[PDB]
Amino acid sequence: HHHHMDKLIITGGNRLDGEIRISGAKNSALPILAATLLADTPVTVCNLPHLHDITTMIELFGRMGVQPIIDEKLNVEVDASSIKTLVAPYELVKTMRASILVLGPMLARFGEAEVALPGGCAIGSRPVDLHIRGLEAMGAQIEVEGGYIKAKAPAGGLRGGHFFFDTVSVTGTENLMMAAALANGRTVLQNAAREPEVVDLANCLNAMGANVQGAGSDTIVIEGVKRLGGARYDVLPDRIETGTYLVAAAATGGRVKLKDTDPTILEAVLQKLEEAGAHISTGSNWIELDMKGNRPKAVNVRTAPYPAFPTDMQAQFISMNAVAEGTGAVIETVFENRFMHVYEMNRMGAQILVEGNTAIVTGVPKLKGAPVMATDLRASASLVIAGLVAEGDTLIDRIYHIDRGYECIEEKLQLLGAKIRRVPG
Amino acid sequence: HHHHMDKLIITGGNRLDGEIRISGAKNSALPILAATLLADTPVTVCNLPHLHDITTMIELFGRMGVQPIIDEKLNVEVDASSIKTLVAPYELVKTMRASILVLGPMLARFGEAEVALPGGCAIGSRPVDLHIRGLEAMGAQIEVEGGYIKAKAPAGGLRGGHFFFDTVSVTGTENLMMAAALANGRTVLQNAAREPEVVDLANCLNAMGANVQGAGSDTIVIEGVKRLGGARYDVLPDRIETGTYLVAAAATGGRVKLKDTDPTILEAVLQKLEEAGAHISTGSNWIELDMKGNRPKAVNVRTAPYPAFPTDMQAQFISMNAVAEGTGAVIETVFENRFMHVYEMNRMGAQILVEGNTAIVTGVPKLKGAPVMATDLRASASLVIAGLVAEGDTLIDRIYHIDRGYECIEEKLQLLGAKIRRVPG
Amino acid sequence: HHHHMDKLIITGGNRLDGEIRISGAKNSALPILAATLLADTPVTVCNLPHLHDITTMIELFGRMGVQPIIDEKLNVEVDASSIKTLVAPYELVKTMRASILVLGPMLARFGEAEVALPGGCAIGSRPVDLHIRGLEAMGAQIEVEGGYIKAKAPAGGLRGGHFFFDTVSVTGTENLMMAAALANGRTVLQNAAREPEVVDLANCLNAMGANVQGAGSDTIVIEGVKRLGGARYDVLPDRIETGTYLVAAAATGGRVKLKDTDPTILEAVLQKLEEAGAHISTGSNWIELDMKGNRPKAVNVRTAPYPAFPTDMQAQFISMNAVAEGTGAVIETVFENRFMHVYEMNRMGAQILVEGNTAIVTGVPKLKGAPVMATDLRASASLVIAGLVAEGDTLIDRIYHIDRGYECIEEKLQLLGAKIRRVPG
Amino acid sequence: HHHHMDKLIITGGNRLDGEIRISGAKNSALPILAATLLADTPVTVCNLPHLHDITTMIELFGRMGVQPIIDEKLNVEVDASSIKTLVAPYELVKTMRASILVLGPMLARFGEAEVALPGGCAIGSRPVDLHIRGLEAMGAQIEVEGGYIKAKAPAGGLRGGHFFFDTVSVTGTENLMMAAALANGRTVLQNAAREPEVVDLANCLNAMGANVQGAGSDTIVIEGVKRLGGARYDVLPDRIETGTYLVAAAATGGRVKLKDTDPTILEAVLQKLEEAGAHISTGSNWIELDMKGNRPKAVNVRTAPYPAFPTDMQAQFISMNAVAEGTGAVIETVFENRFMHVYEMNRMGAQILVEGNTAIVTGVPKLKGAPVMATDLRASASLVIAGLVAEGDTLIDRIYHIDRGYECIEEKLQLLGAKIRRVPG
Numbered sequence A, B, C, D: 001h002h003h004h005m006d007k008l009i010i011t012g013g014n015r016l017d018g019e020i021r022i023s024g025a026k027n028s029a030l031p032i033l034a035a036t037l038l039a040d041t042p043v044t045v046c047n048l049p050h051l052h053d054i055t056t057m058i059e060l061f062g063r064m065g066v067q068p069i070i071d072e073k074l075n076v077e078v079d080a081s082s083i084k085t086l087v088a089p090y091e092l093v094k095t096m097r098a099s100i101l102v103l104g105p106m107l108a109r110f111g112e113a114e115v116a117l118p119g120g121c122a123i124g125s126r127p128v129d130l131h132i133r134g135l136e137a138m139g140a141q142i143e144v145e146g147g148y149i150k151a152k153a154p155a156g157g158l159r160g161g162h163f164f165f166d167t168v169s170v171t172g173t174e175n176l177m178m179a180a181a182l183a184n185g186r187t188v189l190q191n192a193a194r195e196p197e198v199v200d201l202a203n204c205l206n207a208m209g210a211n212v213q214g215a216g217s218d219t220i221v222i223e224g225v226k227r228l229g230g231a232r233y234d235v236l237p238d239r240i241e242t243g244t245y246l247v248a249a250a251a252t253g254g255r256v257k258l259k260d261t262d263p264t265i266l267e268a269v270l271q272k273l274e275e276a277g278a279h280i281s282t283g284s285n286w287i288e289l290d291m292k293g294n295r296p297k298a299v300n301v302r303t304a305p306y307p308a309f310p311t312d313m314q315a316q317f318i319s320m321n322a323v324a325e326g327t328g329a330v331i332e333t334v335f336e337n338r339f340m341h342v343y344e345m346n347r348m349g350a351q352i353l354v355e356g357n358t359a360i361v362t363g364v365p366k367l368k369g370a371p372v373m374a375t376d377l378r379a380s381a382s383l384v385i386a387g388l389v390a391e392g393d394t395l396i397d398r399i400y401h402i403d404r405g406y407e408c409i410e411e412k413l414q415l416l417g418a419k420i421r422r423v424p425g
């Protein structure tokens, strides 16, 4: 029973050892839940991770007059044809900018949508101009007023169009894919995001009766249909959660077997772990990592859109490099100043120099436990890893960020022999 | 009585007109309050601004067993003789990293100090390695443990030394100046910060009986003295507050007379305002700005250490450029990621492209009111200015940031004819 | 007959109008010429552009004891069976770093290679660490000595391997593809370059008997074969030459029909030209652009690997933006300091601000003729375009750069009505 | 006798040991030679270094109709009374952009000037907007036409003005200082460059009858005078030549005593050398460095305007770090892409990673001799130093760059026991 004021207390010094199951991808669940707005019979979304971003998306639907049902198996059924209010309120959107994913499907299905324009997120520069322009390319009339994106479809509905992304955008690609699914005619999205969650969304849409081809490549072709039905869909495994537990095991010089995952959606990460000296073996749906008694070797990292190394794994590799042998350069090209975790790890004795988009990490044998503060729902997992490799106790506050991004992180780490406990708020 | 949950509601569209008084500099008050820890007889600090960072510094002193006396005029007398605990606790330091300013004076006066190592601040990369290295150059033995800087002076006290600043540091320069003031022998600080608050601290130290020469230049020479006495010091005017009200008047196409200020501590800002079309007249302690019925012209800005254009004025010039005639490039060289205000102004219909350290602003005639969120105790004043030039109402939340950095901002703006109200939390 | 000291003299002010034929891709010709070193029977390469990089590659082969034959139709036949010396000399490599393309095929075919390590190129940072690590992944043992990359295959020849490109690399992908073609076993290249020249190379290798699949996607799978035979291969059209003449037309407000090209290999460029106001029609192998005498509209541009907007078209869009209506931001993510053309255009009265990887262009109605200096075999084409839109005469020297990258540029522009002349050195 | 096609051949492996005399500063000589245009009686400039930039400035004066006389003591006397043509031609300016230094004095003394606008320099972005805007602040009306800055003073000549430098500019400060010296009234330059050469220029102007105060500080005040007379002026020692030979000695683990220099104009460099393990002693006009045969320790460096670490010493510290013990980060904030020397050193087996403005150097015990190419009149001295610490021979081409920036470099190194020879072109 997580609470906003929860903390984690970690005692470092244990080599991890054990097996856990990987949960469904948070960032596939979010767009697929938004996609349920397109369906005229109920959609059941399965393999959901139990983390707070799902709760927020469910709350958002509630504010629109749609009451999702969580069954005994913890799957979510959404029947969007009870929708009352075509508005995604600022009160909710300000807490989770991924809420913007309802813009595309709401507009395509219902002919109009008012969605709060996301403001600042501490991660970095994250405008949504390409979401707006892409929809305008489908005939949408859009204005910004009162802090809302106010969108209206042409008479007869959205029309298929060509749209070229000047910058690769994950949720931008997802938003336009969903809108295109019910548009009149052919849509071609160029320089599309290739992220596995984009493919998962396309596969869900096709299960609902859409015609989405090319997901996973630079070019997505959508032939719009008049209506979509509801299906039952299991979201793919979470590659960021997968990578995070592999790094935790590597950093502690231990080992882990991950089940219900997929090695083919984090090749960049697996290769970097092999560079760090990890012994890795894989199967269709499992990964085993074993350091076999060695400290990790420092590695260089460069973030970029999939299939390159993910910005959502960058912080975790800093915490591993922090206790590795040698010097590693960690470079961001996606979110150039996403390094808040560095300055917390500095409190724990890490040796890290930051210049612009580059973090230069000099590994030390062990960090030093200290209280630190989470701020980033994916990157702050690095603070948990840092705690695992620190002398003494590390007390992490503002865990609510981490609880947005990971299912019960301390319960899974306890199964791997970590000394970690949640301190109730 | 300010409350953590206060909001500001603004209605835009009024040309400002009136006169107000500028308060003492927040960032002179903070190091001068730290400097009072050096004295063996009480020091009284005057012309203090009534804002929350001073309250936090007073609370920090209390935690160490020093209870400042606040008189009827809100002057603060500090008697450090009662000090009980040579520790600046994480619980407080984590709320205000400027707390690190007590490290130098406590070490030099009392021979030891434990001060929590600041973690992350959302503004950007802000390590304090130069504070530590500088103190080590004076013979201090320093380790980081449990998240604390644990410092001990040699037997006989700190010794004079040479320290070269690889990067210009405002509080770094201040910390070492204070440590040097009671050290044994001569300290030379090279590539020193030239900020007017550094000069003000030196002038206060000298009033207290120190021997600090060269403040304001690249090189500060300190001859340590035996004891520092009991001065009554009026801190200099706040140049950021000054610039902020000047920009507010300019952005609204109105005018303002500022009293109890000093034009010579913001020449960069005055020149940029003239470039924007402002008519400016000055006297020894006042500034008058009048737009004479013109819209501001877009200007380019480049932040750098004093006397260059201040990073603490950068956001405010974005909000002016956002309603100016033409396109203006706003470039950070101090905090390359300090642009969170941009994304709030985008909710208000601003036209701003951000690429790394560069914000390209295309002016529009008027912004559009929307709810927005403060995050930065100096830069979020730009959201107040944006509200003043927006159509309709702008509701700003998390005002507690702004109340750290500005004395009663809505009360001063009311005197200039702004339609602005504090909504009590 | 070109000479190292040739100049171009341009008189601006004429709307271009006419049609020309597009030549084969220089950057397909170079890797395909390299690939002929793999074959045990002669390979004939057709549709070659007549420009200096081809001449340099042929000279390189000569230095290794391979003498290509240029027939009457200007096709090049290469019979690598006479090869004598497995060395790419520094004397030639220092003039053309793309010479490194012989490293992969020489190593795979002959079991060893010495190729001079390229030093500095004024474009910016261009290390070849991925070429080296990629070949090591196929069993190469590589040393750097005397300024040479000295590479040796393992017993029995190169072996199939897996390699993940941390950064997308065009010639790195090509080098590894060629080496994989004769390796023992399966090679998988991940995060591969998708440039059309990479596809063209794969298609030529397959025509020679190889088994290269997936070129054009991020994952290339190669099944090595023991030997490769001859082929007669026509290289695809040059998308950069195509883009350049389209911009030349657009910038002068003219029109042009380009024959023997392919719109599908420059979709990003075509879309940006439409944004600038151009009317574009296309056929299977032609593109026609008509400005209808209108001044172009300023556009924003962001370079990235194919299919995104190419760095090799960036400078050309600066020269169009230089005379456009409005302000356009031109952003590099590939070669972040490739802006030397800007400072030449400034001599012609362009209004351009550069900060880091961003050029901010404010368009003026016309430039002003002045003597300027080429430095970049592709980007300096922008100086020719600038001259076409300048008042009076523009004299460009160091044309030898441009002659590397474009087939007789003045002769093609003359066909479009340009007033341009080559001044013989 | 120097020739354009000269090369240097270096044999590495010797610890340097000896003493040489330091020459006058090139970058004081250049603006002081320009300043002679202000005087109505001959000025004699003394302690000049014998290097090619001086020769170019003398040739420039020649093209204007002024014939400097080089006397028996190799001092230069300039009598600007004979001047005939107020034009600095592109033919000369294109070879040395520092030629722009004649703009300010020509305009101030003669009421008009035409000076070619410098184009590209491979170092990176070097616009001269602040020179132009600064002179406009003194009443100049300026056009760019035919690639010339064409400048005209108002009726009665230049007028005292205020100018704030948005970015610190060395030659910008010098140009405005010279122009102000003959202007009618008071000029204030704010955020002025503090470089020692700026002080040296001011002292020479004052010797000539000017009234320049505050040079060396952020603020320079000039009271214009109607005429300036002659002077005999000895330029100060060259701090960059000084730094370079100290690094050459340190990199080889040797010793050197430098005479006729001044430790107080390179404190940042001396401190970094001590960090690298050098034992340094100084006197009023000499510096002695002794490594005692020890390998240097890696250091971090960050360039910035004087008195910070100079960009003109950056490359030399990369060459020392290249053979040092450890990892050193070398960061540019002045010329953020000035790293061409890195890629030549990579040919010699250096281990350097460049990302943006940061070079990460991993030291190795020795480099490996290879042919390399100079491109930068100050930074390419790093290639000479790299050759001194490389196994075998290093052949450096395009030595003419180095001959611009250093007086007879191989002759001075020979006095220290280097094995180095000039190969005549």
Ligand SMILES: C=C(O[C@H]1[C@H](O)[C@@H](CO)O[C@H](OP(=O)(O)OP(=O)(O)OC[C@H]2O[C@@H](n3ccc(=O)[nH]c3=O)[C@H](O)[C@@H]2O)[C@@H]1NC(C)=O)C(=O)O
Binding pocket: A027, A030, A098, A125, A126, A127, A128, A129, A130, A131, A167, A168, A169, A170, A171, A172, A310, A311, A312, A334, A335, A377, A378
């Ligand atoms: C942080 C999260 O994950 C993030 C993850 O970090 C990023 C990068 O991989 O991709 C998703 O964000 P996103 O879709 O908002 O980010 P993208 O749009 O791909 O941003 C990539 C780049 O494109 C730029 N961008 C994006 C959209 C747009 O209209 N304009 C634009 O310029 C952004 O500024 C950024 O530089 C994840 N969120 C979801 C719901 O899929 C999270 O879990 O909340």
Ligand SMILES: C=C(O[C@H]1[C@H](O)[C@@H](CO)O[C@H](OP(=O)(O)OP(=O)(O)OC[C@H]2O[C@@H](n3ccc(=O)[nH]c3=O)[C@H](O)[C@@H]2O)[C@@H]1NC(C)=O)C(=O)O
Binding pocket: B027, B030, B098, B125, B126, B127, B128, B129, B130, B131, B167, B168, B169, B170, B171, B172, B310, B311, B312, B334, B335, B377, B378
């Ligand atoms: C944000 C505030 O104001 C800030 C103001 O923005 C900055 C810049 O002018 O100077 C003061 O901070 P500061 O002293 O922490 O900042 P500085 O140390 O000058 O930082 C300058 C640059 O040096 C770097 N830096 C600084 C210190 C150090 O040890 N190492 C280092 O690398 C920082 O990362 C930054 O890039 C103000 N704070 C006070 C109490 O004077 C505030 O009011 O809370």
Ligand SMILES: C=C(O[C@H]1[C@H](O)[C@@H](CO)O[C@H](OP(=O)(O)OP(=O)(O)OC[C@H]2O[C@@H](n3ccc(=O)[nH]c3=O)[C@H](O)[C@@H]2O)[C@@H]1NC(C)=O)C(=O)O
Binding pocket: C027, C030, C098, C125, C126, C127, C128, C129, C130, C131, C132, C167, C168, C169, C170, C171, C172, C310, C311, C312, C334, C335, C377, C378, C405
């Ligand atoms: C300039 C030319 O064209 C260039 C064209 O600009 C670029 C970008 O599209 O792709 C080819 O160069 P390239 O293959 O050397 O460039 P890429 O390797 O793709 O460089 C891409 C990025 O990767 C980086 N990179 C590349 C290789 C490597 O081992 N390491 C690395 O860090 C580079 O620094 C650059 O930032 C063209 N050359 C040929 C023969 O195909 C030319 O015609 O000579």
Ligand SMILES: C=C(O[C@H]1[C@H](O)[C@@H](CO)O[C@H](OP(=O)(O)OP(=O)(O)OC[C@H]2O[C@@H](n3ccc(=O)[nH]c3=O)[C@H](O)[C@@H]2O)[C@@H]1NC(C)=O)C(=O)O
Binding pocket: D027, D030, D098, D125, D126, D127, D128, D129, D130, D131, D167, D168, D169, D170, D171, D172, D310, D311, D312, D334, D335, D377, D378, D405
């Ligand atoms: C390279 C040389 O030395 C250079 C030395 O590297 C630099 C930096 O210390 O200062 C002089 O150049 P400079 O005066 O052209 O350089 P500065 O003007 O200080 O440039 C500093 C920074 O300001 C920027 N800058 C400068 C002037 C201007 O109008 N606008 C502008 O943006 C430049 O882009 C650069 O980023 C030396 N030249 C002379 C004659 O004094 C040489 O010897 O030829």
Ligand SMILES: [Mg+2]
Binding pocket: A094, A095, A096, A121
């Ligand atoms: Mg949030």
Ligand SMILES: [Mg+2]
Binding pocket: A355, A356, A357, D356, D357, D358
């Ligand atoms: Mg940087």
Ligand SMILES: [Mg+2]
Binding pocket: B094, B095, B096, B121
């Ligand atoms: Mg805070």
Ligand SMILES: [Mg+2]
Binding pocket: B355, B356, B357, C356, C357, C358
């Ligand atoms: Mg950038």
Ligand SMILES: [Mg+2]
Binding pocket: C094, C095, C096, C121
């Ligand atoms: Mg070249």
Ligand SMILES: [Mg+2]
Binding pocket: D094, D095, D096, D121
């Ligand atoms: Mg030059």
